[PDB]
């Protein structure tokens, strides 16, 4: 059923959202002050900047395919309308 497929794309999207969210908040705090910045190294930030950019890329992909999916809902909804309502 499409409800099993939908739930999946939705679920993956929600994980990259949570993923990115945590990371960003994490990195915000580390750069919030020099006091908190001293408990980290310039090689940790370098690590985080990667982890974060990787999520961004995956998240941006999920938003993109969500866009394509909505494009498909419209096309098919439009087609049905021409068949049954015109």
């Amino acid at each position: 059923a499409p409800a099993d497929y939908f739930r999946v794309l939705v679920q993956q999207f929600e994980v990259q959202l949570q993923q990115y969210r945590q990371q960003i908040e994490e990195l915000e705090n580390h750069l919030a002050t020099q006091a908190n910045n001293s408990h980290i190294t310039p090689q940790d930030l370098s690590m985080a900047m990667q982890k974060i950019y990787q999520t961004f890329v995956a998240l941006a992909a999920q938003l993109q395919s969500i866009h394509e999916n909505v494009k498909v809902l419209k096309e098919q909804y439009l087609s049905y309308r021409k068949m049954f309502l015109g």
Binding site: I24, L27, L31, Q34, N37, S38, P42, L45, M49, I52, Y53, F56, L59, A60, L63, Q64, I66, H67, V70, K71, L73, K74, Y77, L78
Partner: protein, 39 residues
């Protein structure tokens, strides 16, 4: 201790672009959903 006051600025800029990136995609998606209600 810490990092350059400008290295901070660079990262903050990068993160902002990432944000603008994702928001643009969300924007587009919203136009799609709104245009569905209009068509």
């Amino acid at each position: 201790y810490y990092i350059d006051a400008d290295l901070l600025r660079e990262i903050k800029q990068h993160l902002k672009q990432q944000q603008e990136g994702l928001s643009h995609l969300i924007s587009i998606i919203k136009d799609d959903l709104e245009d569905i209600k209009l068509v």
